[PDB]
Amino acid sequence: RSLKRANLANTSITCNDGSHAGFYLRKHPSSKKWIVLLEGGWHCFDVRSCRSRWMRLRHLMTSSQWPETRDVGGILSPHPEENPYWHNANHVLIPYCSSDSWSGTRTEPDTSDRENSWRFMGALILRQVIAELIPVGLGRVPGGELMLVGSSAGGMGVMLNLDRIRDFLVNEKKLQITVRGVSDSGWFLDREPYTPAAVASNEAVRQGWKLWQGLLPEECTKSYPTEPWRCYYGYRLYPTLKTPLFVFQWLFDEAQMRVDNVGAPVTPQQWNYIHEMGGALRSSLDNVSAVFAPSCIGHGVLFKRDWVNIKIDDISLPSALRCWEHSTRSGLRLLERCSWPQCNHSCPT
Amino acid sequence: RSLKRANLANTSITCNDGSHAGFYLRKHPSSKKWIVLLEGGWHCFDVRSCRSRWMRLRHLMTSSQWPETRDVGGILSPHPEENPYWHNANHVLIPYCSSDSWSGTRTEPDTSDRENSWRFMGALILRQVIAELIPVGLGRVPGGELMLVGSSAGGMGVMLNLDRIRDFLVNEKKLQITVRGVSDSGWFLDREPYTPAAVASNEAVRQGWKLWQGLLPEECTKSYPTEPWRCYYGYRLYPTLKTPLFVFQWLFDEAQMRVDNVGAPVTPQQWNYIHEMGGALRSSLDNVSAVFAPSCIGHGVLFKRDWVNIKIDDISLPSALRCWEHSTRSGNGLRLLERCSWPQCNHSCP
Numbered sequence: 001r002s003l004k005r006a007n008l009a010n011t012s013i014t015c016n017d018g019s020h021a022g023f024y025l026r027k028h029p030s031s032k033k034w035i036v037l038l039e040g041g042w043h044c045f046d047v048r049s050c051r052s053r054w055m056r057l058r059h060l061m062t063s064s065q066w067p068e069t070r071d072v073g074g075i076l077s078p079h080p081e082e083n084p085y086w087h088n089a090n091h092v093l094i095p096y097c098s099s100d101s102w103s104g105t106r107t108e109p110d111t112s113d114r115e116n117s118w119r120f121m122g123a124l125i126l127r128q129v130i131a132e133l134i135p136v137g138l139g140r141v142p143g144g145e146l147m148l149v150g151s152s153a154g155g156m157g158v159m160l161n162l163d164r165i166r167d168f169l170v171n172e173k174k175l176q177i178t179v180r181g182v183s184d185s186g187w188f189l190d191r192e193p194y195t196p197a198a199v200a201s202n203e204a205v206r207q208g209w210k211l212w213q214g215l216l217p218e219e220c221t222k223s224y225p226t227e228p229w230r231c232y233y234g235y236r237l238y239p240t241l242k243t244p245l246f247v248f249q250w251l252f253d254e255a256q257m258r259v260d261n262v263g264a265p266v267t268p269q270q271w272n273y274i275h276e277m278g279g280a281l282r283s284s285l286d287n288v289s290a291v292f293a294p295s296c297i298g299h300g301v302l303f304k305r306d307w308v309n310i311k312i313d314d315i316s317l318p319s320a321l322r323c324w325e326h327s328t329r330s331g332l333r334l335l336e337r338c339s340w341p342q343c344n345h346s347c348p349t
Numbered sequence: 350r351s352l353k354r355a356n357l358a359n360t361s362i363t364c365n366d367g368s369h370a371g372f373y374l375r376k377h378p379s380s381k382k383w384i385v386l387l388e389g390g391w392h393c394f395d396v397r398s399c400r401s402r403w404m405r406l407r408h409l410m411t412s413s414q415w416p417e418t419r420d421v422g423g424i425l426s427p428h429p430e431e432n433p434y435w436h437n438a439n440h441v442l443i444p445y446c447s448s449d450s451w452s453g454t455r456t457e458p459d460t461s462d463r464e465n466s467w468r469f470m471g472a473l474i475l476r477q478v479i480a481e482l483i484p485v486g487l488g489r490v491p492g493g494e495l496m497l498v499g500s501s502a503g504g505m506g507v508m509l510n511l512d513r514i515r516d517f518l519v520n521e522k523k524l525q526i527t528v529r530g531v532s533d534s535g536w537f538l539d540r541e542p543y544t545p546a547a548v549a550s551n552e553a554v555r556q557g558w559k560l561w562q563g564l565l566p567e568e569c570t571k572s573y574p575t576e577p578w579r580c581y582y583g584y585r586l587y588p589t590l591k592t593p594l595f596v597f598q599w600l601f602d603e604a605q606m607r608v609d610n611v612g613a614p615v616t617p618q619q620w621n622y623i624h625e626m627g628g629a630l631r632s633s634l635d636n637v638s639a640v641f642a643p644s645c646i647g648h649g650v651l652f653k654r655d656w657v658n659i660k661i662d663d664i665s666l667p668s669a670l671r672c673w674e675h676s677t678r679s680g681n682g683l684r685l686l687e688r689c690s691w692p693q694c695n696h697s698c699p
């Protein structure tokens with residue numbers, strides 16, 4: 001049966017347009033394990049991008065179109081064939097309606113522009129959802145677990161908020177619970193674009209950070225006192241992250257191709273750029289302890305039925321995630337050993 | 350379909366009585382992975398014990414009672430529910446008919462006594478089976494794998510022979526194959542018994558070594574040149590073992606209780622001895638990289654249907670073995686020892 005819509009008790013926590021935020025829940029009768037998944041879908045960082053987003057992707061800026069139930073595959077599927085190790089866990093979906101990579105703390109619209117009217121509350125939404133799971137069972141029985149997982153902007157969202165959420169549950173609330181995070185397709189790089197963009201990658205990030213009042217991890221901003229927004233990049237944040245984080249990243253990630261302004265690749269120049277992009281991604285993952293990085297073009301995987309089919313060295317993604325789970329109960333570096341696009345026989349399409 | 354009996358091409362490789370050795374096979378049409386399971390069943394170490402074994406356990410000294418097929422559960426089951434990760438591998442069973450912990454090389458009876466007719470060829474049987482799997486497909490396609498696994502005396506057999514077999518396949522034959530070992534209930538301790546035994550452990554061990562002409566790994570025997578038979582103990586051999594080895598051991602192992610001469614426990618004194626034996630086993634596993642050691646009374650696990658049900662920290666044995674397999678895929682770990690210390694404190698004990 002489906003994930004059912006739920007409300008937040010604090011009605012001041014809202015989506016971009018002021019509609020109330022919320023989540024979807026499928027409670028399991030006896031599990032003490034919880035999978036909380038953050039949806040993604042880019043972001044907006046100024047008046048023009050946010051107007052375009054409202055016109056083209058309205059459902060990401062409001063809860064007014066949310067249905068009463070949702071069905072999500074992959075790691076939130078209740079079917080053992082599709083979700084071999086977490087089918088019988090408590091499942092939570094948090095829709096993305098804040099356009100701020102789950103970092104925003106801006107309760108009222110920016111004073112700078114009285115014409116920029118959007119609320120950016122992503123960080124406060126996540127914190128409120130985790131708070132509302134507690135009276136519904138999260139951490140109630142000692143020995144329980146929380147895996148906080150996210151795709152795309154949700155993957156960033158996990159990285160940004162993981163240590164805070166862990167500290168809230170374990171230190172503030174005194175729960176006897178193991179917390180871990182998974183970032184799927186949220187590991188982005190700032191690098192020279194294929195051709196010059198309308199605005200520098202880093203310039204959009206800085207503007208967003210200001211507009212959203214982005215809440216960034218304290219340990220990471222200490223390393224970047226003059227440019228704290230560098231902490232939106234996973235490879236910059238990772239060295240000071242204390243809580244276990246599994247990283248899934250397609251080596252030829254389609255969102256990174258859009259960031260790098262490659263275009264739909266139809267020339268050898270574009271393809272060579274993509275080949276090199278893959279190598280840069282691979283290098284950027286050098287210090288990650290638990291990584292699953294196939295040589296395929298894609299974006300997102302954790303909500304997809306075919307997540308069970310992607311394999312590296314004949315090890316499936318759910319199998320790798322399960323082995324990471326075992327090893328962090330108090331990891332595997334699976335990066336493709338061939339370097340070129342679609343050299344993995346199990347690539348989806 | 351069952352595991353089907355196969356013969357060896359070399360007819361000098363025999364069971365204790367001189368009957369021909371062999372193995373059972375279930376070839377999978379596609380897989381490049383092989384599970385090779387060594388059966389156990391104690392050993393005999395002198396004339397008297399071998400005579401008793403012939404009379405009480407004859408099937409362990411001969412192939413004359415072997416059936417044409419065998420069905421073995423656990424890691425050799427072809428059913429996914431029973432064997433979630435290896436149901437679709439090639440499977441091989443090597444029956445135990447040499448009574449020498451898979452270590453013997455005595456090809457000809459000790460001529461000094463004509464009523465001692467026994468051949469002890471366990472190390473030679475294993476080597477030959479492996480050699481004979483090559484034309485059948487072992488390591489034929491690059492990228493394949495061998496998991497050499499063993500219970501009881503077979504667990505010891507794996508530990509004794511693993512580096513040799515890996516060297517044979519990878520170096521001698523140049524196969525592009527990843528080799529790993531598993532010892533189930535093969536990790537024994539020489540400790541003071543609950544009450545003194547008629548024969549003392551290290552005495553039996555030394556006698557068996559001589560009688561079997563036991564073949565021991567060189568890197569271990571260097572450390573014990575005066576007493577190479579010390580290398581029959583897992584904790585002594587482990588430090589110099591190069592190949593990945595997963596150790597399953599029940600912390601209240603029944604064979605250890607038999608060697609320690611506790612008797613069927615019906616008194617607090619016996620139970621307190623058993624409790625401390627578990628503590629000693631636990632402690633002997635201190636340096637082992639990949640271990641699954643539940644607080645349960647038992648002996649053997651890999652051939653059992655219920656192997657899927659034993660859990661430590663909610664991690665099943667097959668799931669731990671699979672994670673070790675992933676983590677050792679380059680030929681280089683989860684230490685799951687029970688967190689409570691007392692007999693049957695695990696809710697999943699069989």
Ligand SMILES: *[C@@H]1O[C@H](CO)[C@@H](O)[C@H](O)[C@H]1NC(C)=O
Pocket residue numbers: 010011012013107124
């Ligand atoms: C509700 O949320 C708003 C915005 O985060 C916060 O300012 C306020 O303190 C919260 N109210 C309560 C009662 O927690």
Ligand SMILES: *[C@@H]1O[C@H](CO)[C@@H](O)[C@H](O)[C@H]1NC(C)=O
Pocket residue numbers: 359360361362456473
């Ligand atoms: C067969 O094995 C026997 C006993 O180990 C050995 O002596 C002999 O050389 C072997 N014969 C072969 C390989 O032809």
